[PDB]
Design a protein around this ligand. Structure first.
Ligand SMILES: Nc1nc2c(ncn2[C@@H]2O[C@H](COP(=O)(O)OP(=O)(O)NP(=O)(O)O)[C@@H](O)[C@H]2O)c(=O)[nH]1
Ligand code: MET
Ligand SMILES: [Mg+2]
Lengths: 22, 83, 409, 254, 69
RNA sequence: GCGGGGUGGAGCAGCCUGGUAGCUCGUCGGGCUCAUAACCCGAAGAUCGUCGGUUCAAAUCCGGCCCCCGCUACCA
């Protein structure tokens, strides 16, 4: 679980933060 | 960048416990990457799968799906046969 | 050196290259072996001499060598100028290199096939790319007239004379050829001598040039002691370079620091200059040049600094990541077999920004009426404020021209 | 011409012979260590029998019978122990590093491979050793090891210059650079590393360094001596890197 | 598949192929390399230059250029 | 530019370390079986890319010159 979520949250964050940074 | 096109045979197959599988054969192993293609296709089908020699195999009937996904990627509608 | 750069545009297999064979005698190679079985793929290149038989009758007076005894009589044809071609490919998706090529051109020749239904997907796509960019010196050509009825190459000349009407192309003259057997080519030479005139370029201007190839002269196995330098391949547009001038490339190579990205200018000296198969000491616009260098050929192998631009060392050129395009759109997608209407631009979308000879991709942050700001991946060296640009999208797996405009700094 | 200092081999000795004619009930062998001394080999002593009974594959044996009277010898290749089949197989390549030297020197001097085996190889036999290791001390140390034993001073220098042929060894290196005059720094860091190399790891034959890709290069040390391969090639490749790294020219082995 | 011609004019293809798929891929050959594009005669010469071969009919007089292979 | 291969018709071993050219198939003949090239037997057939050297002797070791396929790359 919290492994999952942390990396899902991180990937969401990055990918989206990539989309914001871009 | 490159090009290359090939004759594509798609059909239902057979695996162990569990359902049938879908074979996609007939891609040019020099030019085309079955490993990049197949990662893309397992995403479309949502099935596990592999590159089995010069073929991609996808667990379950995905035959209309894949042809519809292969033609999108810029492959010829006229080289593809679902059997 | 060649005085001027002429395109040969058109649809796939309409015989653009075969018409560069019948004028220059030079084949593009048709290479990569995959081009030897496909067709031309990297930008071809070929030069020749255009004299004129003064002592005889035109168009057959228009020679290729110093030899007039071919037509009328001997009086060795006064040399008018030396020229060079740039053969773009004809296949739909090799759109992104033909655009790239079009940053170098002073004029063009549209090769339509006499044995196919006239407005063919790329024939048009190219044409409006021409009308867009500003290459207003066009000559249309009807190529394969050796395999058709004498009615058929006329009825098509109707279809061309009617398309070429509401568009800008007034008397853009349609010279039927047969690139295969090299018949009626000297009348094409009379066209290109009249209509595609040699422009004036001010040499005092800031040295600027584009790059579209670059090659490792080193054969498989030249020893270290005579390791000749790396070779950048491209065309001067403004100025004139000289042998033994200090220089820089832009945006230049990027570094890697743990996932970071950072391009930077490379410096070197001009080791040698050459045009055709003959080495020169200086170089001027019109023609594609090549510049022997003293930088590591590993840097310029396959065609690594493709899209880059060369300038004076210690010059003033912005290396932008983010850019303000003023722009306009085609009402259709003249390119696809299908004419589906160009949608209006959406933010956070991927588009293929051709600027100069570089073919970059980039993401759209802002969308006004006609002013968009585009973040990029690989930077762009913006040598002026008069940078024409071209705007494509991925419509259906294959990249398509949809709008154009100018670069604003 | 390996001449011997005897008439018949002593009985129960091991030596290299060459098969000569394949007959029905045996086979005449030439005992290469005895002036090609024709002996007999029957089947009771052999043991797929067509590659060791080959018209002249050079097989090793034990001498069963030496009838001194008539002059005829029998041999067996069953009665060679396999702990007698290796050390008299290393003794073969030393006795055919010698054969060659006296097969080209006697020729060059224009004399005889008999007067080359009687003078050189039968007077460096008194000097405790196989006559190819009384010359391996000679070519390295001096011609006073040949004179000591009384090897006539006509063979002495034609020996030492016909004894001391190629071996080819290579390596994939990667020369990446960003210097304005990078090509020149490559040529430099290769002509400074491929330097004083003809006298360090000493008299090797040639060194070639070349582009087989763009950044990928092959180096090529050919040498007379096989273990005068890596030694040298590796010192060159170690100095490539070092002289590559000191001068801002990025080098590394594949 | 691989093959070479015998010493009396016979193709020995090293792969056992049915007696049909050789006709279908021997007709296609005819279509791309012998049948002229003007009157469909089969009565043609095959030109070769640098990198452009031509089908030359002995009846009408035209030339069908072919991808050189 | 380096390789990699070239051998009965065909697939190819053998070439390192030279010493009557092997295999599988096909063919062809006969035989065995009720009838099968299923098996048993035999024959035919490669001067081993090419040209030359070295060697007593080479398909082998050696070097020029070709024929297909990996490596390279349109070489300003
Ligand atoms: N009969 C005839 N054949 C021609 C003529 N011109 C070219 N061809 C043939 O058509 C084929 C294609 O020619 P090519 O020049 O490659 O067409 P292209 O449009 O330049 N190809 P690319 O898109 O790569 O630039 C060649 O094999 C050539 O022999 C012509 O005038 N008449
Ligand atoms: C195609 S490179 C452009 C011209 C160059 N000097 C040669 O060729
Ligand atoms: Mg072409």
């Amino acid at each position: 679980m919290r492994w999952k979520w942390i990396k899902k949250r991180i990937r969401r964050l990055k990918r989206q933060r990539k989309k914001e940074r871009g | 960048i490159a090009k290359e096109e090939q004759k594509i045979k798609i059909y239902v197959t057979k695996r162990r416990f569990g359902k049938l599988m879908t074979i996609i054969e007939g891609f040019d192993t020099s030019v085309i990457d079955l490993k990049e293609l197949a990662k893309k296709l397992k995403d479309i089908c949502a099935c596990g799968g592999t590159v089995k020699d010069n073929t991609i195999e996808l667990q379950g009937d995905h035959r209309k799906k894949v042809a519809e996904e292969l033609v999108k990627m810029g492959f010829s509608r006229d080289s593809i046969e679902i059997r | 050196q060649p005085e001027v750069n002429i395109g040969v545009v058109g649809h796939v297999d309409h015989g653009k290259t075969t018409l560069v064979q019948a004028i220059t005698g030079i084949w593009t190679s048709k290479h990569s072996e995959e081009l030897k079985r496909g067709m031309t793929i990297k930008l071809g290149y070929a030069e020749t001499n255009i004299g004129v038989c003064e002592s005889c009758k035109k168009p057959e007076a228009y020679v290729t060598e110093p030899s007039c005894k071919s037509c009328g009589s001997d009086d060795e044809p006064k040399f008018l100028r030396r020229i060079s071609f740039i053969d773009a490919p004809g296949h739909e998706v090799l759109m992104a290199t033909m655009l790239s090529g079009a940053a170098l051109m002073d004029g063009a020749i549209l090769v339509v096939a006499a044995n196919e239904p006239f407005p063919q997907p790329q024939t048009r796509e190219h044409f409006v790319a021409l009308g867009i960019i500003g290459v207003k010196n066009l000559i249309i050509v009807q190529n394969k007239v050796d395999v058709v009825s004498k009615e058929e190459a006329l009825s098509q000349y109707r279809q061309i004379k009617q398309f070429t009407k509401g568009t800008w192309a007034e008397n853009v003259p349609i010279i039927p050829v047969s690139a295969l057997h090299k018949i009626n080519i000297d009348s094409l030479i009379e066209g290109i001598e009249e209509y595609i005139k040699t422009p004036y370029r001010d040499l005092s201007q800031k040295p600027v040039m584009l790059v579209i190839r670059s090659f490792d002269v080193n054969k498989p196995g030249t020893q270290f002691n005579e390791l000749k330098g790396g070779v950048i391949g491209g065309s001067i547009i403004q100025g004139l370079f000289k042998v033994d001038q200090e220089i820089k490339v832009l945006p230049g190579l990027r570094v890697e620091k743990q996932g970071k990205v950072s391009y930077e200018p490379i410096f070197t000296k001009i080791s040698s200059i050459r045009f055709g198969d003959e080495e020169f000491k200086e170089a001027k616009p019109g023609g594609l040049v090549a510049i022997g260098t003293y930088l590591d050929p590993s840097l310029t192998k396959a065609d690594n600094l493709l899209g880059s631009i060369i300038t004076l060392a210690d010059a003033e050129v912005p290396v932008l990541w983010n850019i303000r395009i003023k722009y306009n759109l085609l009402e259709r997608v003249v390119g696809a077999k299908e004419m589906l209407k160009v949608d209006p631009i959406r933010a956070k979308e991927t588009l293929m920004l051709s600027v100069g000879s570089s073919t970059t991709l980039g993401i759209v942050t802002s969308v006004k009426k006609d002013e968009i700001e585009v973040e990029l991946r690989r930077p762009v060296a913006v040598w002026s404020n008069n940078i024409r640009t071209v705007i494509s999208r991925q419509i259906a797996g294959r990249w398509r021209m949809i709008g154009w405009g100018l670069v604003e700094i | 011409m390996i001449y011997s200092r005897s008439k018949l081999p002593s009985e129960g000795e091991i030596l290299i012979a060459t098969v000569k004619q394949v007959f029905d009930y045996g086979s005449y062998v030439s005992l290469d260590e005895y002036g090609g001394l024709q002996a007999f080999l029957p089947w009771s002593e052999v043991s797929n029998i067509r590659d060791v009974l080959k018209e002249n594959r050079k097989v090793i044996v034990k001498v069963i019978r030496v009838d001194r009277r008539k002059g005829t010898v029998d041999v067996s290749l069953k009665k060679v122990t396999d702990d007698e089949r290796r050390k008299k197989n290393l003794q073969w390549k030393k006795i055919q590093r010698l054969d060659k030297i006296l097969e080209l020197v006697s020729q060059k001097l224009k004399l005889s491979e008999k007067d080359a085996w009687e003078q050189v190889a039968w007077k460096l036999e008194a000097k405790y050793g196989d006559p190819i290791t009384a010359i391996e001390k000679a070519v390295k140390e001096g011609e006073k090891i040949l004179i000591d034993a009384g090897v006539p001073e006509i063979w002495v220098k034609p020996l030492l210059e016909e004894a001391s042929r190629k071996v080819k060894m290579s390596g994939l290196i990667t020369v990446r650079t960003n210097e304005p005059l990078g090509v020149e720094k490559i040529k430099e860091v290769i002509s400074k590393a491929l330097e004083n190399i003809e006298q360090d790891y000493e008299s090797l034959l040639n060194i070639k360094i070349y582009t087989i890709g763009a950044p990928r290069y092959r180096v090529d040390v050919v040498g007379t001596n096989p273990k005068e391969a890596s030694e040298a090639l590796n010192q060159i490749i170690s100095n490539l890197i070092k002289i590559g790294k000191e001068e801002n020219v990025d080098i590394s082995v594949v | 598949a691989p093959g070479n011609v015998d010493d009396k004019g016979e193709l020995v293809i090293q792969g056992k192929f049915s007696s049909q798929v050789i006709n279908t891929l021997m007709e296609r050959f005819l279509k791309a390399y012998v049948e002229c594009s003007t009157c469909k005669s089969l009565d043609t010469i095959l030109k070769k230059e640098k990198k452009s071969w031509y089908i030359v009919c002995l009846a009408c007089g035209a030339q069908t250029p072919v991808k050189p292979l």
